[PDB]
Amino acid sequence: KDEQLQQRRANQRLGAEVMSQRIREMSDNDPRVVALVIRQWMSNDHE
Amino acid sequence: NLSGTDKSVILLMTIGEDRAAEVFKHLSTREVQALSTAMANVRQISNKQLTDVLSEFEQEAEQFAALNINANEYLRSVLVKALGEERASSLLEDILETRDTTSGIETLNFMEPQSAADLIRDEHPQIIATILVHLKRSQAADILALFDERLRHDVMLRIATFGGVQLAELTEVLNGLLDGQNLKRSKMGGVRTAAEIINLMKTQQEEAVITAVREFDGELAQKIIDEMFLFENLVDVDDRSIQRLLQEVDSESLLIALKGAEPPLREKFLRNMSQRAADILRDDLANRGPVRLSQVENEQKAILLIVRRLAETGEMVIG
Amino acid sequence: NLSGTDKSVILLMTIGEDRAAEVFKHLSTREVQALSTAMANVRQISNKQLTDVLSEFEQEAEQFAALNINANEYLRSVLVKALGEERASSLLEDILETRDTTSGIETLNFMEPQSAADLIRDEHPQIIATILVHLKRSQAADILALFDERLRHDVMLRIATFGGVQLAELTEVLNGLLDGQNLKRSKMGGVRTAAEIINLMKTQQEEAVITAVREFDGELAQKIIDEMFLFENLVDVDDRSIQRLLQEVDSESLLIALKGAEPPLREKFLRNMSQRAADILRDDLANRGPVRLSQVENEQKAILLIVRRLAETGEMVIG
Amino acid sequence: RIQPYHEFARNLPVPTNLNLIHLKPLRGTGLVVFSPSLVFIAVDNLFGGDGRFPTKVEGREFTHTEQRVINRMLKLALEGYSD
């Protein structure tokens, strides 16, 4: 299962990427707070 | 499944309270509590899923939001600042009520006319008149028909008298009506459900409760018995409908249910057979004696279930 | 065997109290005590087994948990924090009761209708009405049939009166009903077991206790005698059933049991023979005299055991 | 009503629920009673039911839910009388 272990290492890399994506989402929440509120309203309307 | 509402829900449960607070203040209570539960219990987390969620958020930001300034979020505050800078009249707030009022008028059109009437019967007849004028003509006619004769005539007379076309008082009137349906929807009246529940019960206990409610209130008991009624007389059930159901229903099942059913029911059900099928069914009724009443009731319940299935299809009006 | 419940049990007994405490607070008392016993007495430990357990836990963490934030474990606390930050109304707690109430309503549907009735007969008739409305229609009809006529009619009348559709009071009502079945299941009533135990006893002591309980309470003694009854009359036992059992049962065993049995029993059992088998059995009954009553009772007990085996199969209703 | 304790007990509608509420610093315990019809009506109003087809329970002890609703109404009465 060395390939499965490599897949687990890839999953750990994906988890680091997910943390970076979460940081990017946090950055979107952080910079342009107005734009974040506008996107909140837009997602609510799309909902 | 992941709908547009569900995509936003996943976005929210992925991002956090910083945007969840704005979404809540721009949102509704049931979805607020749904996201709170999602935060309390979450099992939709994956390394790729979260990144895809961020990508979907970026798509919404570049399209739905189009990277624009806060939409009525911080803008309404600058609008209030301009309102304060201009005359001391909160017209923007009145327009906000008008926005809910117009949306409520559209909702009123969507929702049931008789429920709208009974929600507005207690209110002022002039309220009824002005709201009926402002509503769609078809919805207005539906509510007019569902009104009693005297109240309907008074509403139309006060519609004729209605010329003030007022201006912010009308908006809060609709807001009050919306708040009187804003409360949890409920609608658990189930006028049909009593009947439905008794039908779900055993037939002997069904008859016993029918007699009991006849003693309780002949009117309510008769309504319950009507809810029990399902294809008992041809003229109301419609022959074309007896024609369509019973060719879908198994002929042997119809036969077994009929030999335990009343002869008028047998005749009205066989009148929509192909003549060969009717003759075969009658000949077998003569041949075999009444089989176990349990099996007869099982076939009758199968007939009723197929009636309910075709009611779900909705191609014709059952009875 | 190692079920999904058992896999989690092995996980817990392998990991320790640090996660066992959270599992207990999210878990139920019998499984808590089962894991406590497992900790007290453990003989499922192996060098490879423990590593495989860790791998299975990692699988659950990457799939069932999907590496997500505490699901309603620490989230409920942040939900309470938001609730505290918002209006002073523990709606989340009411929703928690509603969650148990809805689960209890589903459980109520699963569990026995008459037991549900007798657990709800003592409660308020309005409680019965609202719970019956909220339950499934089929389960509601079953409980309606199992009610007495007067109580059933009162329940349906109060169902008609039921329009308040209330809001957190309904949840705690179900919670009280669940707590009245939350207590150890018991169900050791064994209405059949007395009869079963007496059948397991010797036949002469069975008859003696039957007479004794007839003196005690003719009703209870008659019920016990009914529980003794097993294929004594054709009409209740069903000929098709006498046909099916006795071809499975050895013909010689049937013969030996019949020559010690009553002539009506012999006739009703032979009426479902193949005519050759019936003639052979009757001819041998005429030929051989009554063999030892011990052997006759052994053959009768074998007949009853085969009846119980086919009852286990459940293809038809024995008697 | 001013009457002997035996007269009060005789006039008391059996069955019913009697409650002991001490009054410090005065020695002895106070008593408050409520009718089964009253508790039935209050609890069905809590359920929101009309109650136009009521049932009368005699000799049968109050269920756990009935006694708990009795508990809240008892504490509400206690608070009202206290203020």
DSSP string, B239-296: HHHHHHHHHHS-HHHHHHHHHTS-HHHHHHHHTTS-HHHHHHHHHHHHHS----HHHH
Helical packing angle, C149-161 and B218-228, nearest 10°: 90
Rounded distance between C-alpha atoms, residue B50 and residue B16, angstroms: 12
Rounded distance between C-alpha atoms, residue C98 and residue C95, angstroms: 5
Which element (helix H / strand E) includes C200?
helix C191-200
Which element (helix H / strand E) includes C40?
helix C29-40
Phi/psi at D18 (5° precision): -110, 140
What type of residue sits at position B53? V
Rounded distance between C-alpha atoms, residue C58 and residue B227, angstroms: 56
Nearest CA among C248, C267, C125, B257 for reference residue D50: C125
Chain interruptions in chain B, by residue before each (C–N > 2.5 Å): 166
CB contact under 8 A, B39 and C79: yes
What are the CB-based long-range contacts (under 8 Å, 24+) for D72-76?
A: D73/D34, D73/D39, D73/D42, D74/D19, D74/D32
Residue B213: which of C136, C139, C153 has the nearest Cβ?
Answer: C153
Structure tokens at B157: 């007379």
Rounded distance between C-alpha atoms, residue D34 and residue D75, angstroms: 13
* DSSP 8-state assignment for residue C260: T
* Helix, strand, coil abundance in chain C, percent, nearest 5: 75, 0, 25
Q: Are C241 and C318 in contact (CB under 8 A)?
A: yes
Q: Coil, helix or strand for D22?
A: strand
Chain C residues touching D46 at Cβ < 8 A: 166, 169
CB contact under 8 A, D47 and C169: yes
User: If 0-12 CB within 10 Å is exposed, 13-18 middle and 19+ buried, where does residue B86 land?
Assistant: exposed
Rounded distance between C-alpha atoms, residue B249 and residue B253, angstroms: 7
Q: Are B314 and B295 in contact (CB under 8 A)?
A: no
CB contact under 8 A, A43 and B50: no
Rounded distance between C-alpha atoms, residue C93 and residue B115, angstroms: 32
- Residue partners of B93: CB distance under 8 A and separation at least 6: B83
Structure tokens at C296: 């006759």
Chain A residues touching B26 at Cβ < 8 A: 40-41, 44
Residue B41: which of C72, C149, C157 has the nearest Cβ?
Answer: C72
Q: Coil, helix or strand for C182?
A: helix
Phi/psi at B77 (5° precision): -65, -45
Method by which the model was determined: cryo-EM
User: If 0-12 CB within 10 Å is exposed, 13-18 middle and 19+ buried, where does residue C77 land?
Assistant: exposed
Q: Are B301 and B309 in contact (CB under 8 A)?
A: no
Rounded distance between C-alpha atoms, residue C71 and residue C79, angstroms: 11
* DSSP 8-state assignment for residue B26: T
Chain D residues touching C170 at Cβ < 8 A: 47
Structure tokens at B144: 């007019």
**To what resolution in angstroms was this structure determined?**
5.9
Q: Are B187 and B119 in contact (CB under 8 A)?
A: no
Nearest CA among C202, C6, C171 for reference residue C92: C171
- Residue partners of B56: CB distance under 8 A and separation at least 6: B7, B10, B11
Structure tokens at B40: 């309390």
What type of residue sits at position B177? L
Distance from CA of A32 to the nearest CA of B (A): 8
C269: Cα separation from own chain's centroid? 32
Rounded distance between C-alpha atoms, residue B156 and residue B115, angstroms: 19
C285: Cα separation from own chain's centroid? 43
Q: Coil, helix or strand for C107?
A: helix
- Residue partners of D73: CB distance under 8 A and separation at least 6: D34, D39, D42
Chain A residues touching B65 at Cβ < 8 A: 35, 38-39, 41-43
Rounded distance between C-alpha atoms, residue C28 and residue C10, angstroms: 16
Distance from CA of D19 to the nearest CA of C (A): 22
Rounded distance between C-alpha atoms, residue B16 and residue A47, angstroms: 17
Rounded distance between C-alpha atoms, residue B69 and residue A37, angstroms: 8
C93 and chain D: CB distance < 8 Å anywhere? no
B33: Cα separation from own chain's centroid? 23
Rounded distance between C-alpha atoms, residue C141 and residue C88, angstroms: 41
- Residue partners of B108: CB distance under 8 A and separation at least 6: B116, B131, B135, B139, B174, B177
Asked whether at least 3 C-beta pairs link D and C within 8 Å, the reply is yes
Rounded distance between C-alpha atoms, residue B247 and residue B252, angstroms: 11
Q: Would residue C186 be called left, alpha or beta, if left means φ above 0 and alpha means ψ between -120 and 50 degrees?
A: left
C58: Cα separation from own chain's centroid? 36
Nearest CA among B126, B133, B131, B100 for reference residue B116: B131
Chain B residues touching A38 at Cβ < 8 A: 65, 68-71, 73
Nearest CA among B194, B187, B170 for reference residue B115: B187
Rounded distance between C-alpha atoms, residue B254 and residue B272, angstroms: 12
Could you check whether the bond before residue B264 is cis, i.e. omega within 30 degrees of 0? Answer: no
Asked whether at least 3 C-beta pairs link A and D within 8 Å, the reply is no
Nearest CA among B287, B142, B288, B201 for reference residue C159: B201
Q: How many CA atoms lie within 13 A of A1 on its CB side?
A: 6
Chain C residues touching D72 at Cβ < 8 A: none
Rg of the Cα atoms in chain B:
29
Q: C279-308 as b/e, with b when 16 or more CB fall inside 10 Å?
A: eebbeebeeeeeeeeeebbebbebbeebbe
Chain B residues touching A28 at Cβ < 8 A: 57-58, 61
Phi/psi at B283 (5° precision): -65, -40
Residue B4: which of A24, A38, A47 has the nearest Cβ?
Answer: A47
B73: Cα separation from own chain's centroid? 33
Could you check whether the bond before residue D15 is cis, i.e. omega within 30 degrees of 0? Answer: yes
Rounded distance between C-alpha atoms, residue B142 and residue B145, angstroms: 5
Residue C45: C-alpha distances to residues B11, C9, C38, C39, D55 (Å):
44, 13, 11, 11, 61
Task: Quickly count helices (H) and strands (E) in chain A.
Answer: 2, 0
For the four alpha carbons of B98, B104, B110 and B115, in that order, the dihedral sign comes to negative
Distance between first and last Cα of chain D: 23
Find tokens 């509590």 and name the residue: B33
| Chains within contact range of chain D (3+ C-beta pairs < 8 Å) | C
CB contact under 8 A, A41 and B54: no
Q: B28-45 as b/e, with b when 16 or more CB fall inside 10 Å?
A: eeebbbbbbbbbbebeeb
Chain D residues touching C122 at Cβ < 8 A: 60, 63
Q: Coil, helix or strand for B317?
A: coil
Determine how many CB atoms are found less than 10 A away from the CB of residue B135. Answer: 19
Rounded distance between C-alpha atoms, residue B25 and residue B28, angstroms: 8
Structure tokens at B62: 């570049």
Q: Are A25 and B54 in contact (CB under 8 A)?
A: yes
Measured between CA atoms, the residue of chain B closest to residue A24 is B54
Determine how many CB atoms are found less than 10 A away from the CB of residue A10. Answer: 11
Nearest CA among D53, B192, D37 for reference residue C161: D53
Rounded distance between C-alpha atoms, residue D44 and residue D65, angstroms: 12
Please spell the DSSP secondary structure of B156-187, one letter per residue. HHHHHH------THHHHHHHHHHHHHHS----
Query: Which of D44, D52, D62, D70 to substitute to test the interface with C, most C CBs within 10 Å?
Result: D44
Determine how many CB atoms are found less than 10 A away from the CB of residue D47. Answer: 23
Structure tokens at B160: 């004729």
Distance from CA of C122 to the nearest CA of D (A): 7
Residue C152: C-alpha distances to residues C95, C116, D51 (Å):
31, 14, 15
Find tokens 């249910």 and name the residue: B257
Rg of the Cα atoms in chain C:
29
Measured between CA atoms, the residue of chain C closest to residue D50 is C161
Rg of the Cα atoms in chain D:
15
Q: Are C20 and C65 in contact (CB under 8 A)?
A: no
Nearest CA among B97, B104, B113, B83 for reference residue B166: B97
Find tokens 């970076």 and name the residue: A20
Nearest CA among C170, B223, B231, C302 for reference residue D43: C170
Phi/psi at C222 (5° precision): -65, -40
What type of residue sits at position B216? F
Name D33's bridge partners.
D18
Residue B50: which of A21, A36, A44 has the nearest Cβ?
Answer: A21
Rounded distance between C-alpha atoms, residue B237 and residue D68, angstroms: 51
Determine how many CB atoms are found less than 10 A away from the CB of residue C57. Answer: 20
CB contact under 8 A, B37 and C71: no
Q: B151-179 as b/e, with b when 16 or more CB fall inside 10 Å?
A: ebebbbebbeebeeeeebebbebbbebbe
